[PDB]
């Protein structure tokens, strides 16, 4: 569970913080543990500054290449976005609710996956990785809901649902996430 000032970033139009993001990710991964690995929000920061050696032990007990979907929340300057990795077709996708185009991070992830494939002896994953800024996705219409869009993309992809939501739903998606975090279970 979370403290009440962490949950409080879900209220009204507050900016979500890392406790909401990372606890919801943990919720998703506990709902479908065989298909999804969720990296917490600090993974990409630590990958950028220290490289593979900084995050090598993060997968000491996880075989990423038996998962279907990796979810990597990206904390950029005051902003939440999302990388997903689908292992079946080897696509690294970058999802952003505000139209951001941050090219550095798909290549940080592609380099990580290649190094992890050489180090875990899964050379069938050394070739074939393609990128994609995901087309087609509900966009925010304010300056506060980054984080909520990220978590709704996460929940949709993990449960394999279409992106049937828009900005008008976000107050209610904030209160659903709140409730799911308090009950430690997805709906």
């Amino acid at each position: 569970m979370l403290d009440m000032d962490d949950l409080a970033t879900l209220d009204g139009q507050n900016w979500l913080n890392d406790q909401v993001i990372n606890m919801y990710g943990e919720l998703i991964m506990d709902a479908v543990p065989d298909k999804v690995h969720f990296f917490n929000s600090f993974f990409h920061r630590q990958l950028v500054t220290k490289g593979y050696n900084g995050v090598k032990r993060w997968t000491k007990k996880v075989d990423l290449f038996k998962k279907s979907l990796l979810l990597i929340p990206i904390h950029l300057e005051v902003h939440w976005s999302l990388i997903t990795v689908t292992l079946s077709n080897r696509i690294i996708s970058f999802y952003d609710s505000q139209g951001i185009h941050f090219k550095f991070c798909v290549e940080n992830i592609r380099k990580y996956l290649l190094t992890e494939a050489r180090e875990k002896n899964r050379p069938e994953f050394l070739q074939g990785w393609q990128t994609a800024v995901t087309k087609c996705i509900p966009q925010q219409k304010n300056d506060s809901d980054c984080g909520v869009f990220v978590l709704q993309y996460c929940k949709c992809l993990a449960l394999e649902q279409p992106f049937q939501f828009s900005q008008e739903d976000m107050p209610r998606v904030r209160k659903r996430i709140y409730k799911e975090l308090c009950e430690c279970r997805l709906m």
Binding site: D3, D5, D6, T9, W15, L16, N17, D18, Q19, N22, E26, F39, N40, S41, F42, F43, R45, Q46, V55, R57, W58, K60, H75, L76, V78, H79, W80, C146, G147
Partner: protein
């Protein structure tokens, strides 16, 4: 019996602990806050990417001598 641990944050400086393997890490988290003068709920403590809960112990987490705990501060967006 006791295990040496390194707690490393943004300043990259190593704070060295020597704690019992059976005691709850909540008290390491409290000590580190005090040392750096910030509230405990403003820091996140991770061991190899796993969030350290208050009831976790080095033995339950499989920590070894001079293992590294990373400290991060809150992110918003």
């Amino acid at each position: 019996e006791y295990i040496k641990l390194k707690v490393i944050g943004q300043d990259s400086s190593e704070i060295h602990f020597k704690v019992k393997m059976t005691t709850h890490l909540k008290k390491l988290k409290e000590s580190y806050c005090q040392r750096q003068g910030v509230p405990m709920n403003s820091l996140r403590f991770l061991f190899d990417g796993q969030r350290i809960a208050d009831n976790h112990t080095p033995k339950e987490l499989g920590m070894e001598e001079e293992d590294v705990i990373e400290v991060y501060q809150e992110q918003t967006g």
